[PDB]
Amino acid sequence: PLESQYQVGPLLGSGGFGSVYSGIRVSDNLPVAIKHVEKDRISDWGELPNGTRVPMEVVLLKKVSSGFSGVIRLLDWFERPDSFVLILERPEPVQDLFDFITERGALQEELARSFFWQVLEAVRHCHNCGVLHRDIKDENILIDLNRGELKLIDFGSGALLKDTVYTDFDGTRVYSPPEWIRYHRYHGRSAAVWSLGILLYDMVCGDIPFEHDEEIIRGQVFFRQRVSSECQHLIRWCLALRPSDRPTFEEIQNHPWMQDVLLPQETAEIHLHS
Ligand SMILES: CN1CCCN(c2cncc(-c3cccc(/C=C/C(=O)O)c3)n2)CC1
Numbered sequence: 001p002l003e004s005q006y007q008v009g010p011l012l013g014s015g016g017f018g019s020v021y022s023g024i025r026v027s028d029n030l031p032v033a034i035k036h037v038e039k040d041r042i043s044d045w046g047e048l049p050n051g052t053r054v055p056m057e058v059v060l061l062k063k064v065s066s067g068f069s070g071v072i073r074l075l076d077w078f079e080r081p082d083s084f085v086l087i088l089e090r091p092e093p094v095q096d097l098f099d100f101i102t103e104r105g106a107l108q109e110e111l112a113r114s115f116f117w118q119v120l121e122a123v124r125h126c127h128n129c130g131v132l133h134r135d136i137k138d139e140n141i142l143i144d145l146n147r148g149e150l151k152l153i154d155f156g157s158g159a160l161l162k163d164t165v166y167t168d169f170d171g172t173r174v175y176s177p178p179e180w181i182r183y184h185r186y187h188g189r190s191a192a193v194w195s196l197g198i199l200l201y202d203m204v205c206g207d208i209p210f211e212h213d214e215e216i217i218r219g220q221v222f223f224r225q226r227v228s229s230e231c232q233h234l235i236r237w238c239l240a241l242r243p244s245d246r247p248t249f250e251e252i253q254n255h256p257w258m259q260d261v262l263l264p265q266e267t268a269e270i271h272l273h274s
Pocket of ligand 1 (some may be wrong): 012014015020032033035072088089090094095096139142147153154155170194
């Protein structure tokens with residue numbers, strides 16, 4: 001610990017989340033990501049099943065840890081006097097969905113379907129493990145290019161999933177639902193579905209539908225690209241103004257636009273050159 005274990009590479013990115021670096025585990029040459037978070041910037045703290053003070057992000061990552069490849073794996077963590085260091089899985093090669101869409105523009109619907117399905121499975125995994133991500137968006141989705149597999153990353157805005165109201169929020173405003181903007185009140189799953197609607201619009205149109213509070217609150221969706229009627233319907237459903245008018249996860253995955261998804265590997269072969 002910690003230098004005898006990891007070789008630090010270049011910075012991948014920094015922001016509200018902290019600073020993430022490329023790295024390699026010295027023992028086996030495993031690609032890893034090394035994420036640093038200042039203690040002064042951590043607003044919620046949790047306790048591990050063994051009783052120790054860690055950031056909520058650590059709690060949430062451990063709750064979702066499994067063989068399931070749809071969510072990033074926390075491999076190790078360290079406490080420093082002024083920060084926490086998270087050792088995370090790193091697919092190689094990888095590209096985040098924001099960069100992917102920036103490069104390629106609006107995605108073919110077949111590709112968007114495969115990607116969006118995988119995100120749905122990942123988010124359902126989180127919720128099933130009692131975790132609410134709260135920052136679902138293109139930047140927080142990694143594409144494992146060889147395997148055509150998507151990974152949800154950055155649980156730094158997340159919370160334990162509850163059935164009561166959330167009155168706090170620190171994810172991305174332009175993915176946040178109208179009830180947050182207007183009332184500073186939302187429920188977990190229905191807000192999650194809102195952000196999934198933004199994401200899906202983003203995949204098929206190449207950009208997000210709303211930039212300003214007034215637009216989010218109005219909820220009028222305009223399609224700037226050719227999008228099929230079935231996809232438009234699903235997007236408009238996820239983006240229903242009334243939270244209770246939004247589809248459940250089951251209804252999303254049962255939607256006609258979601259039928260006949262490609263497997264991850266088929267997705268890679270067809271769309272990722274692989
Ligand atoms: C939100 N992102 C902003 C865009 C640049 N950035 C990147 C870019 N490419 C890979 C990773 C990368 C690779 C492996 C694991 C992780 C996990 C990060 C996390 O869990 O916060 C991230 N992160 C930092 C985070």
